[PDB]
Design an enzyme around this catalytic site. Structure first.
Site, PDB file in Angstrom:
ATOM      1  N   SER A  62     -20.578  68.501  67.834  1.00 57.02           N
ATOM      2  CA  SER A  62     -19.263  68.098  67.348  1.00 57.02           C
ATOM      3  C   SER A  62     -18.178  69.091  67.736  1.00 57.02           C
ATOM      4  O   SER A  62     -17.001  68.801  67.564  1.00 57.02           O
ATOM      5  CB  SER A  62     -19.270  67.892  65.847  1.00 57.02           C
ATOM      6  OG  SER A  62     -20.195  66.852  65.525  1.00 57.02           O
TER       7      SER A  62
HETATM    8  C1  LIG Z   1     -21.415  67.113  65.012  1.00 59.79           C
HETATM    9  O1  LIG Z   1     -21.993  68.096  65.424  1.00 59.79           O
HETATM   10  C2  LIG Z   1     -21.990  65.811  64.552  1.00 59.79           C
HETATM   11  N1  LIG Z   1     -23.438  65.968  64.740  1.00 59.79           N
HETATM   12  C3  LIG Z   1     -24.222  64.977  65.157  1.00 59.79           C
HETATM   13  O2  LIG Z   1     -23.872  63.823  65.343  1.00 59.79           O
HETATM   14  C4  LIG Z   1     -25.592  65.350  65.483  1.00 59.79           C
HETATM   15  N2  LIG Z   1     -26.532  65.387  64.646  1.00 59.79           N
HETATM   16  O3  LIG Z   1     -26.329  65.088  63.438  1.00 59.79           O
HETATM   17  C5  LIG Z   1     -27.132  65.708  62.423  1.00 59.79           C
HETATM   18  C6  LIG Z   1     -28.374  64.872  62.227  1.00 59.79           C
HETATM   19  O4  LIG Z   1     -29.345  65.361  61.594  1.00 59.79           O
HETATM   20  O5  LIG Z   1     -28.362  63.717  62.719  1.00 59.79           O
HETATM   21  C7  LIG Z   1     -25.792  65.737  66.894  1.00 59.79           C
HETATM   22  C8  LIG Z   1     -24.796  65.718  67.884  1.00 59.79           C
HETATM   23  S1  LIG Z   1     -25.339  66.286  69.447  1.00 59.79           S
HETATM   24  C9  LIG Z   1     -26.869  66.507  68.669  1.00 59.79           C
HETATM   25  N3  LIG Z   1     -27.929  66.981  69.387  1.00 59.79           N
HETATM   26  N4  LIG Z   1     -26.977  66.193  67.383  1.00 59.79           N
HETATM   27  C10 LIG Z   1     -21.383  65.605  63.157  1.00 59.79           C
HETATM   28  N5  LIG Z   1     -21.025  66.944  62.667  1.00 59.79           N
HETATM   29  C11 LIG Z   1     -21.532  67.659  61.642  1.00 59.79           C
HETATM   30  C12 LIG Z   1     -20.767  68.890  61.366  1.00 59.79           C
HETATM   31  O6  LIG Z   1     -21.316  69.966  61.033  1.00 59.79           O
HETATM   32  O7  LIG Z   1     -19.528  68.876  61.525  1.00 59.79           O
HETATM   33  C13 LIG Z   1     -22.627  67.223  60.965  1.00 59.79           C
HETATM   34  C14 LIG Z   1     -23.077  67.921  59.732  1.00 59.79           C
HETATM   35  C15 LIG Z   1     -24.193  67.607  59.082  1.00 59.79           C
HETATM   36  C16 LIG Z   1     -23.438  66.021  61.463  1.00 59.79           C
HETATM   37  S2  LIG Z   1     -22.404  64.716  62.040  1.00 59.79           S
END
Ligand SMILES: *C(=O)[C@@H](NC(=O)/C(=N\OCC(=O)O)c1csc(N)n1)[C@@H]1NC(C(=O)O)=C(C=C)CS1
Length: 326
Positions: A62
């Site tokens: 993100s």
């Molecule tokens: C941002 O980083 C985005 N993350 C995701 O969509 C991902 N995983 O989500 C967590 C899960 O367990 O599914 C992801 C993106 S690329 C990758 N390899 N995984 C959102 N941002 C945040 C944040 O910290 O801002 C999240 C917090 C829990 C998850 S949604």
């Protein structure tokens, strides 16, 4: 030429990084600290072993979103008044979904809450080749030529190979790969008024020749949006710094292990800059596979960001913009 490294910042970053990795019983961690005005590399810290800051490709997760949002604003594909439907959906087996269902959000809310749905919709207003060129212009797939052995170029897949779902998942940072140094560099486009800086290992007497990515006005508006991340309601309140407004973005990325994304192993990222309106410092923190005391970017990487940023501002003699309360 005078080396860009600041020994006090380097020591601070190293000590706080290793403390956080220990506290969270994590595998490894990395920190980059940059001068936000001229691109000097003030600190590059790693947990023991290799120089992961420069050698290791990570998914930005993100932490890519500020750029997608900025691009959409810059090109006039959205504005600060639009309220987007942010209900989740799927294409075939692939979900486009947030941590919670947010029925709708404006662009500020997309940033604040880290809406994958919102960001994907903004990205989808651009063609695949346009987005590919944009990611390449941020430096993804473009080696830094730092001099360090084993330095990575990162990875940007040719746009002609992209499925339509892939453009969407790239907008919340799947598939793209870059080093933490390359990612921190990208943030110079937001701090240096729309102009990406090359980064330097020597002190610069004037900002080097860069490349415009965004209008100055876009960069300024986006920095203001990013302050929402560190204020109540945002994902990254743990990264707020006494005396300053901090623009930041959290990331929580599923780790790719044994040919699949793991649901219960993550990389926690926190990247930010201060003072938010007139930035002087960028701090980027990543913590790989925390196993104790949480795993969200805000929770895990926020606290060391807070200590490193607060300390760096003090070391550099930057005055608080609001009264101290701690
Ligand atoms: C941002 O980083 C985005 N993350 C995701 O969509 C991902 N995983 O989500 C967590 C899960 O367990 O599914 C992801 C993106 S690329 C990758 N390899 N995984 C959102 N941002 C945040 C944040 O910290 O801002 C999240 C917090 C829990 C998850 S949604």
């Amino acid at each position: 030429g005078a080396l860009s490294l600041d020994q006090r910042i380097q020591t601070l970053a190293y000590e706080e990084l290793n403390k956080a990795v220990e506290y969270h019983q994590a595998k490894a961690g990395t920190v980059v600290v940059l001068d936000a005005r001229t691109g000097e590399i003030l600190a590059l810290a790693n947990t023991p072993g290799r120089n992961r800051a420069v050698t290791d490709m990570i998914e930005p997760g993100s932490a890519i979103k500020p750029f997608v949002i900025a691009k959409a604003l810059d090109a006039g594909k959205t504005d600060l008044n639009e309220r987007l439907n942010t209900q989740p959906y799927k294409i075939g087996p692939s979900p486009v979904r947030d941590t919670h269902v947010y029925p709708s959000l404006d662009v500020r809310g997309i940033m604040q809450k880290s809406s994958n749905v919102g960001t994907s919709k903004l990205s989808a207003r651009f063609g695949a080749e346009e987005m590919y060129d944009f990611y390449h212009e941020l430096g993804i797939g473009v080696r830094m030529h730092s001099g360090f052995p084993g330095e990575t170029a990162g990875l940007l897949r040719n746009w002609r190979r992209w499925r339509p779902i892939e453009q969407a998942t790239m907008s919340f940072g799947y598939g793209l790969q870059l080093s933490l140094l390359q990612l921190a560099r990208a943030y110079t486009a937001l701090t240096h008024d729309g102009v990406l800086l090359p980064l330097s290992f020597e002190k610069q007497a004037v900002a080097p020749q860069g490349k415009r990515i965004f209008k100055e006005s876009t960069a300024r508006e986006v920095r203001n949006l990013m302050v929402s991340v560190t204020e109540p309601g945002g994902t990254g309140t743990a990264g707020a710094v006494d005396g300053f407004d901090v623009g930041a973005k959290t990331g929580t990325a599923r780790k790719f292990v044994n040919g699949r994304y793991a649901d219960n192993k993550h990389v926690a990222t926190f990247i930010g800059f201060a003072p938010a309106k007139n930035p002087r410092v960028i701090v980027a923190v990543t913590i790989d596979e925390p196993t104790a005391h949480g795993y969200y970017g805000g929770v895990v990487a926020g606290p060391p960001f807070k200590k490193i940023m607060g300390g760096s501002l003090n070391i550099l003699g930057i005055s608080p913009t609001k009264p101290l309360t701690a």
